[PDB]
Amino acid sequence: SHKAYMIGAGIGNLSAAVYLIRDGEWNGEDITIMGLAGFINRGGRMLNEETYENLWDVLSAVPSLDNPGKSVTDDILDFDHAHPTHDVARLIDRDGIRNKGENDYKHMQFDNKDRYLLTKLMTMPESDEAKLDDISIEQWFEETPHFFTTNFWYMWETTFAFKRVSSAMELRRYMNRMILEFSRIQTLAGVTRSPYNQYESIILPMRTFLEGKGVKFVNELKITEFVFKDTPLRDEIIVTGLDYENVRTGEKGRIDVAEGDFVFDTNGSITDSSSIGDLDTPIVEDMRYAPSALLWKQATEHFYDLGNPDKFFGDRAQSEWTSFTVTTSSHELINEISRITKQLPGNALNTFVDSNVLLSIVVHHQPHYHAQKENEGVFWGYCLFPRKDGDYVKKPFIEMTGREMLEETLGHLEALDESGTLAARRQEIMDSVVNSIPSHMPYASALFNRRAVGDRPLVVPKHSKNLAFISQFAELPFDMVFTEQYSVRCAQVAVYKFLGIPEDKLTKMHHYEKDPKVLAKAAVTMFR
Ligand SMILES: [Mg+2]
């Protein structure tokens, strides 16, 4: 019987397994998936019910582990509909919340130059994307630096963790795929949240369902090299073996990939080489090159049409940022944040636009984890300039302990709090801390690095017989690479191609950017 081998266990390969089982009528036994106090916020943070067509469809076949008779899609949408989002303190500067006045976050704050360039970028056809090769956002708006002082830039860069040195291609894809969210970017009312963090709300329901269908899960094997069959013209990609190392025993070997078996590789991950600290210990930067990209980099030693992984994993300056998760033993700290920001938990992130490190925090709906106790509260924060000094803790953010990161956050919170109450309650706040876990990710935004078309392999390269790339570093049209939808889409493309399902059966994506009314509203929104 035909077999499938997944290298990486993220949502992309899991969705491939789902597609194989549901639409290809495979047996789970034929699929092998190979991966490797206080909470840590792992996983994707957003979704969008108007987009993510593939994700909702895959997740409509995974049962909820919490609610009998509900699919994971049902869980997620039922929750979100009952917890609508309206960000209030989206932007916070040294004077207060940009809720009102001249800097009101309803104002994009665009030039006429800013709208001209932004409209040119937005209206460039998909077929012309290569014209943007290696052009950063900084470069495309080189003539109008005023852009990088607007509300829109502050909101857009922090919403997705984009840098100005990053690829202008995605900003274009945003303005087309996410066009509907343009008019509501400041309230983030279009964001769709799952009840808990997505590892618990999405990943484990998926693994459980797959495990129940027979899929084999392996986590001791480091796949070390592809083994390709040679051909006279050397175009075809035919994987014949997977060289492995067992990281616990030390055994090495080769798994034979027979004729009719398929291989799914996740060529790179935004969490590769990440490291962790705790309340009193700063991170130690893992200097190793992205381990999940090594199979990819090695295949380029044999084939010429597979891209340049160094574009994505060779420039940490483009890709790195740092986050942290706070756990408290009482609701007090969350109550204080909720009061100072004029916002109930679960209403999207709050960005301190005048902070030196560009710090944002997110307070989720509580609880965010299944093992969260009734008395416990959790929130999450990150900065986009981890090398810069903190405003209140005057050392580089990336060198801070988890405590120091909270202290730097409180400083900004206290600065916005006129009552002075939070600062007064400092000792009690800190005593309530279970942990504050810093989390450094050198490739966190590597999927946004400056890129040229062709720097990423096709999901199924033009002459690949049985190798597919399912990742945020494979080439797919239209979709935003930030979204979990991207990897789910790669999976359907790969599975349907390998199985012979024609592309008109692929899941149909919404094209709001060709509805004239949508464009009209988008055009008007430019002047808001
Ligand atoms: Mg919605």
How many angstroms separate the CA atoms of 416 and 410, rounded? 10
CA separation, residue 331 to residues 137, 278, 328, 432 (Å) = 41, 21, 7, 9
Tokens 């988008």 belong to: 522
For 366, other C-beta atoms within 10 Å of its C-beta total: 18
How many angstroms separate the CA atoms of 144 and 155, rounded? 18
| Cβ atoms 452, 130 nearer than 8 A | yes
Of the chain, the end-to-end C-alpha distance in Å amounts to: 60
Q: In 330-420, which residue ranges form alpha helices assigned H by DSSP?
A: 332-340, 402-416
CA-wise closest residue to 168 among 448, 417, 366 = 448
Question: What's the half-sphere exposure (Cβ side, CA atoms, 13 Å) at 231?
Answer: 13
Q: 487 CA to middle of ligand 1, Å?
A: 21
406-415: long-range pairs with CB below 8 Å, 24+: 406/324, 406/326, 406/430, 406/433, 406/436, 408/357, 408/359, 409/359, 409/361, 409/381, 412/92, 412/352, 412/355, 412/359, 413/336, 413/337, 413/340, 415/94
Q: 306 CA to middle of ligand 1, Å?
A: 37
| Element spanning 433, H or E | strand 433-441
How many angstroms separate the CA atoms of 260 and 135, rounded? 41
CA separation, residue 493 to residues 35, 129, 235, 270, 394 (Å) = 22, 21, 21, 21, 49
How many angstroms separate the CA atoms of 160 and 111, rounded? 23
Architecture of the domain spanning 4-60+195-273+287-311+446-505: 3-Layer(bba) Sandwich (3.50)
Query: What are φ and ψ of residue 255, in 5° steps?
Result: -100, 125
CA-wise closest residue to 267 among 231, 237, 234, 223 = 223
The residues that bridge with 226 in the sheet, in sequence order, are: 242
Residues 186-206: b if buried by 16+ CB within 10 A, e if exposed: bbbebbbbbbbbbebbbbebb
Rg of the chain (C-alpha set): 23
Q: Which two tokens stand for residue 389?
A: 């000094």
Q: 184 CA to middle of ligand 1, Å?
A: 11
CATH of 321-441, one of 3.30.9.80, 3.30.499.10, 3.40.718.10, 3.40.50.300: 3.30.9.80
Query: What are φ and ψ of residue 13, in 5° steps?
Result: -70, -35
| Cβ atoms 361, 379 nearer than 8 A | yes
Q: 122 CA to middle of ligand 1, Å?
A: 24
Residues 286-316: b if buried by 16+ CB within 10 A, e if exposed: eeebbebbbbbbebeeebeebbbbebbbeeb
Amino acid at 332: E
Query: What are φ and ψ of residue 360, in 5° steps?
Result: -125, 155
Amino acid at 95: D
For 408, other C-beta atoms within 10 Å of its C-beta total: 27
How many angstroms separate the CA atoms of 524 and 528, rounded? 7
| Element spanning 11, H or E | helix 11-22
Q: 192 CA to middle of ligand 1, Å?
A: 5
Domain boundaries along the sequence of the chain: 4-60+195-273+287-311+446-505, 107-182, 321-441
Amino acid at 12: G
Active-site hit among 19, 105, 154, 174: 174
Query: What are φ and ψ of residue 93, in 5° steps?
Result: -110, -175
| Cβ atoms 416, 92 nearer than 8 A | yes
How many angstroms separate the CA atoms of 468 and 473, rounded? 12
Resolution of the coordinates in A?
2.6
Q: 49 CA to middle of ligand 1, Å?
A: 6
CA 480 from centroid of its chain's CA atoms: 10
How many angstroms separate the CA atoms of 228 and 265, rounded? 14
| Cβ atoms 87, 347 nearer than 8 A | yes
Pairing assessment for the beta strands 262-265 and 4-7 based on DSSP bridges: parallel
Q: 193 CA to middle of ligand 1, Å?
A: 9
Q: 195 CA to middle of ligand 1, Å?
A: 14
Q: Which two tokens stand for residue 258?
A: 């027979």
CA 337 from centroid of its chain's CA atoms: 25
Q: Which two tokens stand for residue 481?
A: 């690479």
Strand boundaries in 219-329, DSSP class E: 221-228, 239-246, 252-256, 262-265, 275-276, 321-328
Q: 85 CA to middle of ligand 1, Å?
A: 8
| Cβ neighbours of residue 170 closer than 8 Å, sequence gap 6 or more | 162, 448, 480, 481, 482
Q: 429 CA to middle of ligand 1, Å?
A: 34
Q: In 145-220, which residue ranges form alpha helices assigned H by DSSP?
A: 151-160, 168-177, 179-182, 198, 204-213
How many angstroms separate the CA atoms of 192 and 168, rounded? 25
Mapping DSSP to helix (H, G, I), strand (E, B) and coil, where does residue 396 land? strand
How many angstroms separate the CA atoms of 287 and 278, rounded? 19
- By the CB criterion, residues less than 5 angstroms from ion ligand 1 are 49
How many angstroms separate the CA atoms of 433 and 426, rounded? 11
How many angstroms separate the CA atoms of 460 and 151, rounded? 40
Q: 183 CA to middle of ligand 1, Å?
A: 14
| Cβ atoms 41, 368 nearer than 8 A | yes
How many angstroms separate the CA atoms of 26 and 5, rounded? 13
Mapping DSSP to helix (H, G, I), strand (E, B) and coil, where does residue 218 land? strand
How many angstroms separate the CA atoms of 159 and 96, rounded? 19
- Residue 367: asked if its preceding bond is cis (omega within 30°), the reply is yes
How many angstroms separate the CA atoms of 197 and 378, rounded? 11
The residues that bridge with 31 in the sheet, in sequence order, are: 4
Q: Catalytic annotation on 174?
A: yes
| Cβ neighbours of residue 256 closer than 8 Å, sequence gap 6 or more | 240, 241
How many angstroms separate the CA atoms of 187 and 330, rounded? 28
Q: 54 CA to middle of ligand 1, Å?
A: 16
- Apex CA 111: angle with CA 105 and CA 115, to 5°? 95
How many angstroms separate the CA atoms of 385 and 326, rounded? 20
The residues that bridge with 34 in the sheet, in sequence order, are: 7, 218
| Cβ neighbours of residue 355 closer than 8 Å, sequence gap 6 or more | 383, 391, 412
CA separation, residue 397 to residues 158, 375, 394, 402, 405 (Å) = 17, 29, 9, 10, 7
Q: 59 CA to middle of ligand 1, Å?
A: 17
Environment class of residue 492 by beta-carbon count within 10 Å: exposed (0-12), middle (13-18) or buried (19+)?
A: buried
Q: 303 CA to middle of ligand 1, Å?
A: 44
Q: How many residues does the chain have?
A: 528
How many angstroms separate the CA atoms of 133 and 308, rounded? 13
| Cβ neighbours of residue 175 closer than 8 Å, sequence gap 6 or more | 118, 121, 122, 182, 513, 522
CA 155 from centroid of its chain's CA atoms: 16
Q: Which two tokens stand for residue 215?
A: 């899929």
| Cβ atoms 155, 185 nearer than 8 A | yes
Q: Which two tokens stand for residue 264?
A: 């799914």
- Apex CA 197: angle with CA 191 and CA 200, to 5°? 130
